[PDB]
Design a protein around this ligand. Structure first.
Ligand SMILES: COc1c(N2CCN[C@@H](C)C2)c(F)cc2c(=O)c(C(=O)O)cn(C3CC3)c12
Ligand SMILES: COc1c(N2CCN[C@@H](C)C2)c(F)cc2c(=O)c(C(=O)O)cn(C3CC3)c12
Ligand SMILES: [Mg+2]
Ligand SMILES: [Mg+2]
Ligand SMILES: [Mg+2]
Ligand SMILES: [Mg+2]
Lengths: 245, 487, 487, 247
DNA sequence: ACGTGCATAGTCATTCATGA
DNA sequence: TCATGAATGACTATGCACGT
């Protein structure tokens, strides 16, 4: 068991449960999204750590400079575990670390920067499956009489719309389908019923198979060598669609 | 270089600041209960079409529209004012429909302008109802380019409903919110008893307005302070939150607070108790836990020791925290450009007067417009009776000026009417189309007579205010939230 | 809970970010030389009517319009982008007419959004010329509500004129600005010699485009780097400021710097000299004084010691300061959704291609509209020839549909034409107006003939580009600022 | 007497002049970062220094001294002027013989003037007595003639006058662009500020005079003091006749 | 001494590539 | 290490009156 704040980051909205095994840390993008998340959460088991701005690239940046970064200190301090050789998983304050960023490309970028921080400083968190990715909604179908439905893809939107119309439901062509462009546009309720309610949230558990292959990919994509990265993108971006086919 | 004495400069400058702040910044107009920034935000959104019949516009667009046309000040503070008008715990009847993160009753600040959207609420649409029918005086904006309204129609008593608080110079205002249905009853009485004196009117209105109705619910303890505020314009109203004692399986007791008095920050409240615990002031308390959520609302659990009495701890909380706190009523509002402390019967009467003005002006507007339409229609009807000649005349004319000048002489018609004949489409020459022009004339002449009748009878005018207001209240009126108890 | 491998996530996420930044953020489209934010700001202002024919709008309104409809990002950085497009020391040909404090070449920051106003410049109006005539492909915005343009008509070569600098992922761009009159000559040649191969085209274009022309004036030393940039797409161009040696009556020679190379901060430049003199790196210097003002422009006076040679100190300044600095040219632009390093002959050719597309599309649009009006006009003329009959028919109809159906039968007419006859006013039945309808038909049929001729002849199409561009250059073209000298 | 100007122990916001002679130097105390920014650009850097003040100045009449000395903006003024305060006032150390207060023409500019004048009268009174304090009058309008040079107006009357005269002279204005109305110093650029408030050959300055010190002392205490009631009755008494002070 | 609400924005840290 | 330029806003202090 571990004490919750009521010696940790000021931005941290800690949970109430003293059991790390049941506790969760939502690492959120932005002050707005983190603010609403702090309200819509279950304060018993879910803690919120909002991160501001692009995270520093630990692959490029020198070690001492990374340790001076306020956002990195917040993560390391909140997770309770050390880093590198001084890493001790026994002091992990949350057995679930949910990264929650915007659906847009800059959210994706922040994900790669966080995953790089974790893989380089605190790899066992990934190996033991403590790291997860929340999938935010993209659309909210606002039926005239029925309860609203959330969609996490363009396909699902078309499907739920098709089904609802076939069922005899109806939507306004003005209000209609609200499209989310970021977590910051959502309120507390919306975030709960899509990303934080454990009975409805869509989480993806980060797994680590080949450590050596991963090590090389991280260094290529995140490293200082531009040429390697440039050729990698021009080589593989052509086939990014067909990774899960 | 001109010389100026410091006394002249100081006196002139400070008075100019004080007066504009009093009349044009900090204090509400008695008729619509709005400060200049509020009025300008709402009208900007209204004119931009950001209405409930359309999807929320980005709130940045509302701020920029307000800035560019009406309110020559910063975007930052204007956004704050807009945000306030959308918070359900600030306004008893919100005027802005907010979409996104607009903050909380605690220290959680609202999201930035970029993240949020906003539009007018249905009640705010009643504030602006028929504003385009010359129901209120308009004046040029800060640079003469466009017009802005001096006051809104305010088809429900917004000042008393939503209240107002403002710090001016040499004075300040603090009017609490009230329940719309109770205010309506008071208005209905004032309309029926339009000849009643101030003495009778105050007794009647005080009977219907039972007291302030805060958006945060809670309790009002006592009746003296309320009576003072309505009879004097000043009064101290004691507020309380609601506490429900819960027992535990072990047999431990805990106090559950689910409501707090108006304008009490939830986070500051919890912090205040927390600091007054260590500070060994509020003994008997064992543990403080905030079990609040978006689904259960406010829920502050105060577990007390076994050797502690619930009411003793509750009384200590009333004494040493804002669980019990008083609202300092000061009924100050701008009346005809002058700041004035008002009795409750004065507040109602001044609002009723405004409504009657609005209804008469609307009627006058509609009556003028009806005559114009009738005037042109009479011209068209004359053309139809001599249609063979009218067409032949226009055809044989070398220009349209010759045709027009001829039409006046032909049918003995004005130039406006003659112009309308020229602007007439060949569509309107069809059999059924000719008939509609006749019927439309007959239709309008009935409307004109009705309008003239309204202007001639104060009874109908008052009847309209009553009926239209009743419709609003039936649609937008809600239950009382704040419970009134005795000592 | 679904499992995902870290390699799959990393590769897909980073590639999606890199590609969006490359194609849709940091790098310019070759056809109009604009990044997405630039294009969206300008179109927002354009659609909002913030044009040179009306007074400056509050810049907050441009930001909010861009933010709310096209650019789903923050108001802060969008304002920065708008401001930069209004600075004469940043853009060789400013696209935004700024009113107020937009900063300086030094560390004086621009005023906040609330203080400044903005509208489009005349040249920016050429970027958007006839954009409403289907001259460019439009796509739905970020939420499907409205359409936005994929590219602007860009009736002057904006990429080469104003240049571009951008940091993307895996690559970056740095195109310098050029003199419009020189660019026009190159385009004029490309149009005349439309069949010339790349080798000839490169030689020709390089002869007319003498080199970059910076808004900050200064000097270009050497010709090698310029040649590399145009031949390779990469080159190092050495820039210099202007130094004028002045003598005193006491014998105190001083260096007066009146110009600096492109993108050199005035305040940083003075500080760099000052810090290099205090520590001891630029001996011979006695005193540094900034005599600059809004009335004389840049004027940094560097008084040197008596036992010092002016030319030595100037070379020391070239060596240890940005008085001499290189522009790292990397001619990278997006071509058909693909990032590409381009020769100068490729940049010109691609722009000329875009212009020809614009002119052909415009002609096709105008031809379609011309046919439509002509079609309706043909209907009107038929009505005029049988005017007596037309009226009699409409009169006997119970509805307008019976009247229409009859008109079709009477004159052999479409539903569109008959409807147009119905909507016709009695205004146009005057003598001159009937004649005006006739002549209008004759006019359009002449225009249609012209338009058809344009589409059938590439010669005319190229002629249009030349003549229209020539008109633009004669009106908005200016002298060269950057002087080109040899080693 | 001469004193060193800062060039790469004075406030960071201060854009000092180059002249080392206080008799020849001027300090423009400006309202706002934007206006101060433009002033810094349009000024004559030889004799004119700029000290921008941000926000409403602290009321030295209401706030206790220790709190006043901790205020960053007050410290900037005291430090820039070089002179001490109260008993430690030494006019010999005055770094500028002209202290121009330049605020917006609007109501909030007027308020900042009274707060600054209160600071000066209470902490550094001799500056007022010896005529080192001035008030700049910003322009309100800029008439943009189609062919002629633009004209600036400092009142509604002058606007009407210059408009009438120009039209009578055969000049013409656009009814769109037309007459630009200034709502604050922050809306002006460097050139405009020079040609209306900083060019010593065109600027309209007012020199603050102090006749009756005892009467002044009373007025400052009424208007700026902690006593609200006194202030309320003074405003309700005298605001009715603010028009007729110079009639 | 703190809350209230309408008035009077610059500073702070990262990604990313390239050349000093 | 620093500049470039579009991307990812909270904190900081006064006036003003009034009540605990
Ligand atoms: C809070 O993050 C930001 C920071 N900082 C503040 C201090 N901590 C660092 C991590 C981020 C900043 F120093 C500037 C900006 C900005 O300039 C800005 C903007 O819109 O211009 C937006 N943001 C936030 C994350 C989006 C900024
Ligand atoms: C620069 O002055 C301000 C200050 N502070 C910043 C530093 N200490 C004092 C001098 C003023 C502030 F702490 C907040 C604001 C604001 O919140 C604000 C706003 O638009 O809301 C405007 N301003 C400036 C003077 C107008 C503010
Ligand atoms: Mg985002
Ligand atoms: Mg603020
Ligand atoms: Mg920024
Ligand atoms: Mg102002």
């Amino acid at each position: 068991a571990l004490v919750r704040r009521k010696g940790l980051p000021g931005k941290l909205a800690d949970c109430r449960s003293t059991d790390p095994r049941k506790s969760e840390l939502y690492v959120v993008e932005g002050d707005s999204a983190g603010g609403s998340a702090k309200s819509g959460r279950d304060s018993m088991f879910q803690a919120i750590l909002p991160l501001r701005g692009k995270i520093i690239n630990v692959e490029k940046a020198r070690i001492d400079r990374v340790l001076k970064n306020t956002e990195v200190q917040a993560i390391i301090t909140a997770l309770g575990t050390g880093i590198h050789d001084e890493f001790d998983i026994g002091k992990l304050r949350y057995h679930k670390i949910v990264l929650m960023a915007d659906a847009d490309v800059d959210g994706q970028h922040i994900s790669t920067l966080l995953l790089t921080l974790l893989f380089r400083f605190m790899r066992p968190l990934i190996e033991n499956g403590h790291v997860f990715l929340a999938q935010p909604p993209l659309y909210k179908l606002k039926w005239q009489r029925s309860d609203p439905e959330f969609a996490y893809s363009d396909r699902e939107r078309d499907g739920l719309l098709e089904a609802g119309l076939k069922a005899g439901k109806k939507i306004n062509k003005e209000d209609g389908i609200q499209r989310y462009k970021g977590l910051g546009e959502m309120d507390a309720k919306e975030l709960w019923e899509t990303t934080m309610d454990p009975s409805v949230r869509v989480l993806r558990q980060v797994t680590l198979d080949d450590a050596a292959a991963a090590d090389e990919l991280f260094s290529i994509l995140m490293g200082e060598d531009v040429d390697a990265r440039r050729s990698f993108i021009t080589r593989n971006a052509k086939d990014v669609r067909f990774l899960d086919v | 270089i001109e010389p100026v004495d410091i006394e002249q400069e100081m006196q002139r400058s400070y008075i100019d600041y004080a007066m504009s702040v009093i009349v044009g910044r900090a204090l509400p107009e008695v008729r619509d209960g709005l400060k200049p920034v509020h009025r300008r935000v709402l009208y900007a959104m209204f004119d931009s079409g950001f209405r409930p019949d359309r999807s929320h516009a980005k709130s940045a667009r509302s701020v920029a529209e307000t800035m560019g046309n009406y309110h020559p000040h910063g975007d930052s503070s204007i956004y704050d004012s807009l945000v306030r008008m959308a918070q359900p715990w600030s306004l008893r009847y919100p005027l802005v429909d907010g979409q996104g993160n607009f903050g909380s009753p605690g220290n959680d600040p609202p999201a930035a302008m970029r993240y949020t959207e906003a539009r007018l609420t249905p009640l705010a649409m009643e504030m602006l109802r028929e504003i385009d029918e010359e129901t209120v005086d308009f004046i040029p904006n800060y640079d003469g380019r466009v017009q802005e309204p001096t006051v809104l129609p305010s088809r429900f008593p917004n000042l008393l409903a939503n209240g107002s608080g403002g710090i001016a110079v040499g004075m300040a205002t603090n009017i609490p919110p009230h329940n719309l249905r109770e205010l309506a009853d008071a208005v209905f009485w004032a309309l029926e008893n339009h000849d009643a004196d101030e003495e009778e009117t105050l007794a009647a209105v005080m009977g219907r307005v039972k007291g302030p109705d805060f958006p945060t619910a809670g309790l009002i303890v006592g009746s003296q302070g309320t009576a003072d505020a309505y009879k004097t314009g000043r009064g101290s109203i004691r507020m309380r939150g609601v506490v429900e004692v819960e027992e535990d399986s072990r047999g431990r007791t805990s106090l559950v607070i689910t409501e707090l008095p108006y304008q009490v920050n939830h986070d500051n409240f919890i912090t205040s108790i927390a600091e007054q615990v260590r500070d060994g002031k509020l003994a008997g308390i064992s543990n403080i836990e905030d079990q609040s959520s978006d689904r259960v609302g406010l829920r502050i659990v105060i577990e007390i020791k076994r050797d502690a009495v619930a009411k003793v701890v509750i009384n200590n909380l009333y004494k040493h925290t804002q669980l019990q706190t008083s609202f300092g009523a000061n009924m100050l509002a701008i009346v005809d450009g002058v700041p004035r402390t008002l009795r409750l019967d004065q507040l109602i009467r001044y609002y009723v007067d405004h409504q009657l003005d609005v209804i008469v002006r609307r009627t006058t507007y509609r009556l003028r417009k009806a005559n114009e339409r009738a005037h042109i229609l009479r011209g068209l009807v004359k053309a139809l009776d001599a249609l063979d000649e009218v067409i032949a005349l226009i055809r044989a004319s070398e220009t349209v000026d010759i045709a027009r000048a001829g039409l006046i002489e032909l049918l003995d018609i004005d130039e406006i009417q003659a112009q309308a004949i020229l602007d007439m489409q060949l569509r309107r020459l069809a059999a059924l189309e000719r008939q509609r022009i006749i019927d439309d004339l007959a239709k309008i002449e009935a409307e004109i007579a009705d309008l003239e009748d309204i202007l001639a009878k104060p009874e109908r005018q008052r009847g309209i205010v009553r009926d239209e207001l009743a419709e609003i209240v039936d649609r937008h009126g809600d239950d009382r939230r704040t419970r009134i108890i005795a000592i």
